[PDB]
Design a protein around this ligand. Structure first.
Ligand SMILES: O=C1CN(c2csc(-c3ccccc3)c2Cl)S(=O)(=O)N1
Length: 297
């Protein structure tokens, strides 16, 4: 269905129509907490807010608000936290969330600067010797090491709760070649990256939800999560035909608005999943193929 639908939608050039229908059917819930006057400076974008029912609450005294949503996929049995690229004043909140939610990995799909503008604060240390201390949330962050690839970087960070002195290892998966409102260079480079996150164990149910973000936390982030969830469902059932991508996307949209921002990102989601199915169903040789095609070295 997904593959016959793809060639079909593609033979009639109606991706914009298909995408817009999803937008029209998308859920609409209130974001009153996000719209409160006191939270205006905690939002990067006026028109991108987390619904109240699924927002992540900071276990905080003063203000529990952060622009982040818990995408809880009941059937797939995996959860993700999609959030905006933290602001200069919310980096402490960002790491507090990571700590309280017990996340093991953080997936970043954007670059700090895109099109001459700052789409995300430098929330992690770029140098081992220069660790970061977030005074407001009493947290300390240290870069332990990093493995730089051609189009993505994986970092090992140590997050410490200065209050209790406990420490945890956080893995940072940074995709540096995914244009804003754009799509990855190829399904291969994307899957190669997705599988790296999977192999790390960061998506395991034994950990808290992986934190995923781009600039707004809905376009590139939504694409990443949709593809992952679809492959997971398919994997659980070992049946590619039982996956209704559009349905999954609509379910995800019940938890955060605007997931997947362009018709091409949706189209790319299909490509990624269709190609990923090969591995899921037993052709693991393809994993090595993506690695080659991605040109990561
Ligand atoms: O592919 C994308 C595009 N992204 C966006 C950047 S500004 C933006 C936006 C800001 C304000 C109003 C409407 C839309 C969105 Cl949406 S994202 O960083 O969520 N991933």
């Amino acid at each position: 269905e997904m593959e016959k639908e793809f060639e079909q939608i593609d033979k009639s050039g109606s991706w914009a129509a298909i995408y817009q229908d999803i937008r029209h059917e998308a859920s609409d819930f209130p974001c009153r907490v996000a719209k409160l006057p006191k939270n205006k400076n905690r939002n990067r974008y006026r028109d991108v807010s987390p619904f109240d029912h699924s927002r992540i609450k900071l276990h905080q005294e003063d203000n529990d608000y952060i622009n982040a949503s818990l995408i809880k996929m009941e059937e797939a049995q995996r959860s993700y936290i999609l959030t905006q690229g933290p602001l200069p004043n919310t980096c402490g909140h960002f790491w507090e969330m990571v700590w309280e939610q017990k996340s093991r990995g953080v997936v970043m799909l954007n670059r700090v600067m895109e099109k001459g503008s700052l789409k995300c604060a430098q929330y992690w240390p770029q140098k081992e010797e220069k660790e970061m201390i977030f005074e407001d949330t009493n947290l300390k962050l240290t870069l332990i090491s990093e493995d730089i690839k051609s189009y993505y970087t994986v970092r090992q960070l140590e997050l410490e709760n200065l209050t209790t002195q406990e420490t945890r290892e956080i893995l940072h998966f940074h995709y540096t070649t995914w244009p804003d409102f754009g799509v990855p260079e190829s399904p291969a480079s994307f899957l190669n990256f997705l599988f790296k996150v999977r192999e790390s164990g960061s998506l395991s149910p034994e950990h808290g939800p992986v934190v995923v973000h781009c600039s707004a936390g809905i376009g590139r982030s939504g694409t990443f999560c949709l593809a992952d969830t679809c492959l997971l469902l398919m994997d659980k059932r070992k049946d590619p035909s039982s996956v209704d991508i559009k349905k999954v996307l609509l379910d995800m949209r019940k938890f955060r608005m605007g997931l997947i921002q362009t018709a091409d990102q949706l189209r790319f989601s299909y490509l990624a999943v269709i190609e990923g199915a090969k591995f899921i169903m037993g052709d693991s040789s393809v994993q090595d193929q993506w690695k080659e095609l991605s040109h990561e070295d």
